[PDB]
Write an enzyme that holds these catalytic residues in place. Structure first.
Site, short mmCIF file in Angstrom:
data_model
loop_
_atom_site.label_atom_id
_atom_site.label_comp_id
_atom_site.label_asym_id
_atom_site.label_seq_id
_atom_site.Cartn_x
_atom_site.Cartn_y
_atom_site.Cartn_z
N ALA D 13 -19.84 -46.43 -41.89
CA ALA D 13 -18.32 -46.83 -42.35
C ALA D 13 -18.35 -45.64 -43.45
O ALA D 13 -17.55 -45.88 -44.43
CB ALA D 13 -18.31 -48.05 -43.08
N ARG D 87 -25.49 -33.36 -41.96
CA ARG D 87 -25.93 -32.02 -41.61
C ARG D 87 -25.65 -31.46 -43.06
O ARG D 87 -24.29 -31.52 -43.32
CB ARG D 87 -25.30 -31.42 -40.45
CG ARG D 87 -25.65 -30.10 -40.28
CD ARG D 87 -24.95 -29.71 -38.89
NE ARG D 87 -25.33 -28.31 -38.36
CZ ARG D 87 -24.44 -27.16 -38.51
NH1 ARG D 87 -23.25 -27.54 -38.61
NH2 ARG D 87 -24.99 -25.87 -37.95
N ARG D 93 -33.15 -28.78 -38.67
CA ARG D 93 -32.89 -29.66 -37.36
C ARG D 93 -33.93 -30.65 -37.21
O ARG D 93 -33.74 -31.69 -37.06
CB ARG D 93 -32.52 -29.05 -36.21
CG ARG D 93 -31.05 -28.21 -36.15
CD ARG D 93 -30.73 -28.00 -34.66
NE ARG D 93 -29.48 -27.17 -34.77
CZ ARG D 93 -29.20 -25.82 -34.58
NH1 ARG D 93 -30.28 -24.81 -35.09
NH2 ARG D 93 -28.08 -25.31 -34.67
N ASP D 153 -15.78 -27.39 -32.89
CA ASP D 153 -16.03 -26.00 -33.33
C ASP D 153 -14.60 -25.39 -32.63
O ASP D 153 -14.26 -24.45 -33.13
CB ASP D 153 -17.28 -25.30 -32.45
CG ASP D 153 -18.46 -25.71 -33.08
OD1 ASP D 153 -18.48 -25.97 -34.54
OD2 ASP D 153 -19.54 -26.00 -32.47
N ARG D 156 -11.97 -25.72 -35.28
CA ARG D 156 -11.94 -24.69 -36.53
C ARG D 156 -11.91 -23.40 -35.66
O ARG D 156 -10.81 -22.72 -36.63
CB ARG D 156 -13.16 -24.73 -37.07
CG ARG D 156 -13.71 -26.03 -37.79
CD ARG D 156 -14.86 -25.85 -38.74
NE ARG D 156 -15.03 -27.17 -39.28
CZ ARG D 156 -16.18 -27.99 -39.12
NH1 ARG D 156 -17.19 -27.49 -38.44
NH2 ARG D 156 -16.22 -29.02 -39.77
#
Lengths: 312, 312, 312, 312
Positions: D13, D87, D93, D153, D156
């Site tokens: 949430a 991230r 990663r 991606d 954008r």
């Protein structure tokens, strides 16, 4: 000072005109004025009233009136011309242009007199010559007199490809220059599914069959109907162009636009890729065509110029 | 396991049926099957194809097919019946019901055979008796056989009030029981602008004139058109009901519903306030009526029952 | 000459302001300018960029920029003010008004300087006194300086009623005058389900509990969140008002409007029923109130006037 | 028998999850269940309530609840996973996958237990390895466990190109394989404006700069915000995928999908072009890649497999 709605007048209250009026109202794009001749005033009013009476159901806020008085079109932002005789198989372009251009003279004068700053979008066929006829009468800059053609052809193409591949219509694209029928110059190399070239997804003969179906597509609907002609997809195509203009979207779309050097041609209207926005034609985009495409387009130009000779 | 689209079949490919099909597709509510008789298969296919060819323009993902084969209607979630002869001024309900009920027998049987769990929404007039005729043939629970009437009447009323007051249609409400014309029982006391009672905003005689206009409203459109009848607002009304069902919205709307005690009446269809959702009629809402309203509704009941006597 | 998009500036890039900007863009209502102080320029730009990057997905054509330079707000059609400290339980109106009115002085001057013909919609609390503070600084006619209050309160009420009855929110209506909390003057007699009075559908005590929930509704969200405050429903309420203005819809809605005789009061802002359109406040609608309603509204007036005394 | 709404549960949430829930509700796609841990039950309920309270304003009919009890997710058609740590630049990663995969184990088990036939869409990063982790725990066929990456991606990219050319976002397309950042394999040769290849419209260095901006785009938003991360465009991307599934649209979109031979790779998730519909992954579309594209994709595969080694 008062913030006011856009205004569109739709000339011709047959099925494509009525349908365009409804779709514009439904999208809350404008107040709509649906126009036809005095002798058909009551049916025009009846169509507009029925549309208006739908508005509380769907919840759209639009005025929609029917009229035969061009005073009611005053200060229209866009005027969409759907008046005239519909194209049919076996009708020659030359006969249709003589018929439709005679009807349109007084119409264009009346439009321009009441909305000197309108952008006119022309449906009436044969649209390459008819848009020219409107342009010569209106006294407007070329950017503000445009015709519809390639949006409808690409819509049909995309429908056929979508059904062939069982894929969303949202993700199919088509690309056409020129005009309808034998005048269409499709670029299947610029036609995709999700950006993937269609030549990689559909074998040559099937793709050729779909292109031929696109060329014949208006006649196909005429043949199935028995009487009448298409109007949902032509209306939707007009509304997409109208929306691009009213909302200054700068869409990249095929349109019938006046050429003064673009693609090497001058002094005619031709289907070409444009940027469409609040000025009308923002730009004609000139592609690098392959030799075969350029020969096809030269033939389309010669065909349009032959139909223009009919105009008086 | 596959998540699948809803399916609606629209019976009758005249203007109200075709328009309903287009509006449903446009809203991505369902895949649509547009049905008519075998002799009209090609025009039905042509209408559906033209609608489908609009879909890439507006971007809607819907299948739309035309057919004369009720196999293609199999497992429809909703079936909307628009077939039959349109109501006109000077046509008696008794003649129209004889005509339309004969046509409909085989239609209802074919619907029920292919979609045993469908909800049927009936447009065909005279709708109070015609919905009953469909109900008796279909073998469905009453909650799943419903008619359209009050949505259209309230839409016209709201349009007239909105224009009288120059206010958004979004904020006007109307309220009607019974059916159309002389059978309509309006409750202006339950009719508002932004919740404000209309009796406080519009003088009695003007409000009476608007109610009378509502009673006559379908005929008004018939008179203006010269040939044909309304179809945008009737289509929009069908689609609002269909949407309530497909999306289980539990809307409060007037509908033609079978009474077994509600309002004191039994064994007929009558226009009443309902909750409309995924079961069809979720509830019939019983109002406390004033003496005059109740007398009017008693007259409407007697009128409907007189038309029912014609059914064989 | 170029047809151009509407322009809205949203002042304050917290969650309600950002959310309003996104919703306006999403609806293609305007190009949006999201404004905050120089020290927060980069986060404001980041919010606006993220919103802009959503636009190709959903397909909406809007420019959205972030700024700290009021030059970028020039010639805005509507300016929505969301800046300032959020209301919380236990904060007195008097402390909040002192805080927020000091912040707002320079803001209003900057708005008015760059968009002399804007309509300003004020969210900032306590909104009755804050809208007055904006009105006194801006130099605008009263019709062009308005506040938000009753749309949000009625939205919460409608949500509670819809859940109580298990009915579509589309068909529930509420009606409030005054302001929030103890200042709210609800008219449950003008509150309906499908036009049916709610007093006939819900027992007194339950309806009282729902009204009390509405009074406390912003605090309820504050209490659940632990930190922060509501922003989806406040944003939606701002956008509905903005849409009414930009599209000249003449909606009937509760708004915070300046009174010069209406309801017997003068020289304050108060929540009242208005017609909202392209001029801003088109009309304040004066209802016939019952004695108890009028006493409640008198108390609300006295409360607002007490908060006004804090303004310098 | 009752026609019922679709059901989507949104796990997490935070801003991307909340935003996804709101957008789904707003589009009337489903009833929504917003889920988070027991310790955050009240804020989750507060977010959901605020969204619900917006619904009468905009008019959308959706239930929206907040919960910490996976029982409330039962029989979800789609479950969207947004839980976990976002991230950020400078986070490796490998560290993020260790963190997020530990959190997710119990979540996936709880999802699968309550909705054995759900399609899961994963946002959580690093999405190539995280989608694999969900797939291994869930016990679902690969077609029903998918991740989000390329939609965002490409969104954008399309935004940047649209602003560069001043053209509608509706007409720009992008094409990416692989994943984010250094793992992205863009195909600018399959990227167009109105079907016209972008390499013909924008010089090489500018186009390279826009591709690099796309690679860095999530970090860009993180850097501007100072605290937090993007959520409007990620939410919109999730909703587009969810809509494709719920409405069986068979969209052509980039998605993170499990490979068992496609593109020559096996036994990992990778960003590839898919047909997305009511079964989840309907097909992985295998393109003919150029040598450089294939080397880049091989590097992306090796990178994903290196992150997979962290999973326990």
């Amino acid at each position: 000072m008062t913030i006011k709605r856009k205004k569109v007048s739709v000339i011709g209250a047959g099925f494509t005109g009525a349908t365009t009026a409804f779709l514009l109202a439904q999208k809350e794009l404008a107040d709509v004025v649906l126009v036809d001749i005095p002798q058909l005033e009551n049916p025009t009013k009846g169509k507009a009233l029925d549309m208006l009476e739908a508005s509380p159901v769907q919840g759209f806020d639009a005025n929609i009136i029917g009229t035969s008085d061009y005073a009611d079109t005053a200060d229209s932002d866009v005027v969409v011309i759907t008046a005239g005789i519909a194209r049919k198989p076996g009708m020659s372009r030359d006969d249709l242009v003589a018929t439709n251009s005679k009807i349109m003279k007084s119409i264009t004068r009346d439009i321009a007199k009441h909305s000197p700053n309108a952008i006119i979008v022309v449906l009436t066929n044969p649209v390459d010559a008819m848009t020219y006829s409107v342009f010569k009468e209106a006294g407007f800059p070329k950017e503000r007199v445009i015709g519809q053609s390639g949006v409808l052809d690409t819509a049909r193409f995309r429908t056929f490809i979508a059904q062939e591949l069982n894929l969303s219509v949202k993700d199919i694209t088509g690309f056409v220059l020129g005009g309808h029928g034998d005048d269409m110059v499709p670029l299947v190399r610029y036609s995709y599914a999700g950006g993937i070239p269609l030549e990689t997804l559909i074998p040559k003969e099937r793709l050729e069959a779909i292109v031929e179906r696109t060329r014949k597509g208006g006649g196909e609907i005429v043949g199935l109907l028995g009487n009448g002609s298409a109007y949902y997809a032509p209306a939707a195509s007009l509304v997409e162009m109208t929306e691009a203009i009213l909302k200054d979207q700068r869409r990249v779309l095929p349109a019938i636009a006046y050429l003064e050097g673009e693609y090497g041609y001058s002094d005619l209207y031709l289907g070409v890729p444009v940027i469409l926005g609040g000025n009308g034609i923002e730009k004609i985009i000139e592609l690098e065509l392959l030799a075969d495409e350029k020969e096809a387009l030269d033939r389309s130009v010669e065909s349009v110029r032959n139909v223009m000779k009919v105009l008086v």
